Write a protein that binds this ligand. Structure first.
Ligand SMILES: *[C@@H]1O[C@H](CO)[C@@H](O[C@@H]2O[C@H](CO)[C@@H](O[C@@H]3O[C@H](CO)[C@@H](O)[C@H](O)[C@@H]3O)[C@H](O)[C@H]2NC(C)=O)[C@H](O)[C@H]1NC(C)=O
Ligand SMILES: *[C@@H]1O[C@H](CO)[C@@H](O[C@@H]2O[C@H](CO)[C@@H](O)[C@H](O)[C@H]2NC(C)=O)[C@H](O)[C@H]1NC(C)=O
Ligand SMILES: *[C@@H]1O[C@H](CO)[C@@H](O)[C@H](O)[C@H]1NC(C)=O
Ligand SMILES: *[C@@H]1O[C@H](CO)[C@@H](O)[C@H](O)[C@H]1NC(C)=O
Ligand SMILES: *[C@@H]1O[C@H](CO)[C@@H](O)[C@H](O)[C@H]1NC(C)=O
Ligand SMILES: *[C@@H]1O[C@H](CO)[C@@H](O)[C@H](O)[C@H]1NC(C)=O
Ligand SMILES: *[C@@H]1O[C@H](CO)[C@@H](O)[C@H](O)[C@H]1NC(C)=O
Ligand SMILES: *[C@@H]1O[C@H](CO)[C@@H](O)[C@H](O)[C@H]1NC(C)=O
Lengths: 173, 53, 108, 173, 173
């Protein structure tokens, strides 16, 4: 919840669904259930794919032989080559470790952005037709079937469908 | 000059506080030492911007 | 009538940084990463004193130049101190081979 | 104000309060005053703590001896060891300097996010009960005591408390 | 559209305008047209200026001579100096390549933030006076001349100007 959801307006996670990292929880007369958002989920995971390929590939590992050895009349080259190699090991160590911390932080922010984006997409259809509730959810002033669920998933609502039912069931409140 | 004072890192320009990670001061050192750069300054922000009006 | 507002901190501070998108970027609080300063002294490590040659070259040190204090008491130390241009090279000259290697061997 | 507040919809800073980096300014009949948001402020500052510990610690400073010296029959090793060490100094210099610029930029964005998050939290309670005004603030269509202030700080309002007073004092406007 | 616009709620780009990277498209009785937002556009481009100066300048290129050569009784120094230089080349290569990827990603996010910020600025004046429509645009419940356009560009509306016209032309809807 850097941008305000997860440990934000949302508190905790849900183990009920495992098909994909995002989704909805539908609630209606036919019942309850969880259902995953494969569209943006798979888009994101492809992002992670192109990331980690663009992490691992950036190395080039030679056909290498690391080590050397010297007498005690070559201490310059010894203590040097120590200083050399320890220099590099510390550098790669430092940079790589920073890269792990940063890229995991940016990964969380990537997720945070995606969920928040999607929340606004959910919001975009149902602005006056249905209300914010609590956190994470919207209550309808009308009724919604699984057709309405699946339609609302892929970015389809038909705004005038239940516009009047919302226009009346609001008005008691 | 030379003095009875104690330290953990040292260089010809002086004895050195080994607390901080870096110097820009002089490359040569002995001890548990900061690391040299060619720079003027390095200052992270703790706080944030200052505007009265 | 009543009102709520946000709030956050400013101060009298004029401490600055440089940044990707702006320079001399003033903030309220900062922290200098850097140790730009030196005490201008030759302190010692840890309570362990360093060795001192004063004017002497290492040849005048190791060999036993009487003007160089031998200082057999100095059994071990923190680091070696010289000047750049040591006065007392060898009173009777003679080429000294592997000065570099020896000094490396007597790094510590 | 990368995300839209500070030099964004907000113009400038406030010196009146020094207890913590964030807060509110309360305005009511009893009077005016500033009051700091220790919750998110301290959370953030702990973030800075874990940051800078995760900056300084990533170095490992050996029990080191830097320097060497050579004759003029060793110019290869001389000009080498120059090229070596200057190589490293420039590398550490470059990487570290970039890290200062980036991490201060990301620090500003961290702050920007936190304040914007909090602004939405303030907004979340009082959506229809009270209105946006100007920038940075909300005017109430009702009246709020210090109990109401402190409640609204920790994420408590009781939405139906002044829902009707807002429902009427709106309606002239 | 990391933060939700470009490939977000916005689908595609516009070739009609070339003066500056951002702007508006005005639509009114006098006609249609595009018009660039030089304020934030130039601010951003100055950001890119200070960036790339703060990229290129961070190098220091010595008066350098790269190469060496040896006999076959110096294979240690040969294979070393190979390992040395290849070490560095791979390091600079790695770091710089990461920096290109990251800074272009952060560039897109910089743009995304700026446009989204501006969208909220547009929104901030016309909250009830005029409505969200579709994506990217707002329809007015009143009429707007080029004076109204240019005023709304620089952050000026005079909220009570068409407040009543919106207050009536809403009410059929
Ligand atoms: C230790 O170092 C000191 C300081 O360098 C040496 O003393 C100096 O030695 C030079 C040698 O050329 C002296 O100059 C010579 O003086 C004599 C007269 O004494 C003259 O015949 C030469 O033509 C030349 O001018 C210099 O005076 C002398 N200075 C002092 C203050 O002693 C010293 O010899 C070194 N000792 C050892 C054991 O290495
Ligand atoms: C190091 O060299 C300096 C030379 O500058 C020595 O200085 C001399 O000190 C004596 C008294 O001890 C004076 O009488 C001389 O006039 C000084 N000479 C000069 C040129 O200043 C110093 O004594 C030497 N110290 C050691 C430990 O060798
Ligand atoms: C969206 O879902 C509805 C039913 O929920 C379906 O009729 C329609 O074809 C779907 N559209 C797309 C683009 O998948
Ligand atoms: C060394 O540096 C630390 C941190 O900058 C400081 O707390 C301490 O007082 C310094 N000590 C000396 C002797 O400079
Ligand atoms: C700013 O305030 C701090 C704390 O009161 C003080 O240390 C500093 O001297 C002040 N600077 C000026 C210019 O007033
Ligand atoms: C910061 O840099 C800008 C560059 O134009 C300049 O206007 C301003 O005076 C500078 N401030 C300080 C304190 O150097
Ligand atoms: C929140 O504030 C109210 C009064 O403003 C207080 O009664 C309540 O205990 C507070 N809750 C928490 C969790 O601090
Ligand atoms: C904003 O635009 C209006 C007309 O559209 C003009 O009268 C006013 O001077 C402008 N203000 C600024 C600060 O440019």
């Amino acid at each position: 919840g850097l941008f305000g959801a997860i440990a934000g307006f949302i508190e905790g996670g849900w183990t009920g669904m495992v098909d994909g990292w995002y989704g909805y929880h539908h609630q209606n007369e036919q019942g309850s259930g969880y259902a995953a958002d494969q569209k943006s989920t798979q888009n994101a995971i492809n992002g992670i794919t192109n990331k980690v390929n663009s992490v691992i590939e950036k190395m080039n590992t030679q056909f290498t032989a690391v080590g050397k050895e010297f007498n005690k009349l070559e201490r310059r080259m010894e203590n040097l080559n120590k200083k050399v190699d320890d220099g590099f090991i510390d550098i790669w160590t430092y940079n790589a470790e920073l890269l792990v911390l940063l890229e995991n932080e940016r990964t969380l922010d990537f997720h945070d952005s995606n969920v928040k984006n999607l929340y606004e997409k959910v919001k975009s259809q149902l602005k006056n037709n249905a209300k914010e509730i609590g956190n994470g959810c919207f209550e309808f002033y009308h009724k919604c079937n699984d057709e309405c669920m699946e339609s609302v998933k892929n970015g389809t609502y038909d705004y005038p469908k239940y516009s009047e039912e919302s226009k009346l069931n609001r008005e008691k409140i | 000059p030379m003095d009875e004072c104690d330290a953990k890192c040292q260089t010809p320009q002086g004895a050195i506080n080994s607390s901080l990670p870096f110097q820009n001061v002089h490359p040569v050192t002995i001890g548990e030492c900061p690391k040299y750069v060619r720079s003027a300054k390095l200052r992270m922000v703790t706080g944030l911007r200052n505007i009265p009006s | 009538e009543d009102t709520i507002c946000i709030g956050y901190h400013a101060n009298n501070s004029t401490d600055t940084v440089d940044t990707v998108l702006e320079k001399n970027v003033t903030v309220t609080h900062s922290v200098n990463l850097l140790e730009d300063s030196h005490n201008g002294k030759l302190c010692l490590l840890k309570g362990i004193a360093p060795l001192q040659l004063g004017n002497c070259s290492v040849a005048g040190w190791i060999l036993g130049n009487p003007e160089c204090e031998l200082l057999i008491s100095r059994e071990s130390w923190s680091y070696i101190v010289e000047k750049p241009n040591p006065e007392n090279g060898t009173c009777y000259p003679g080429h000294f081979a592997d000065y570099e290697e020896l000094r490396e061997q007597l790094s510590s």
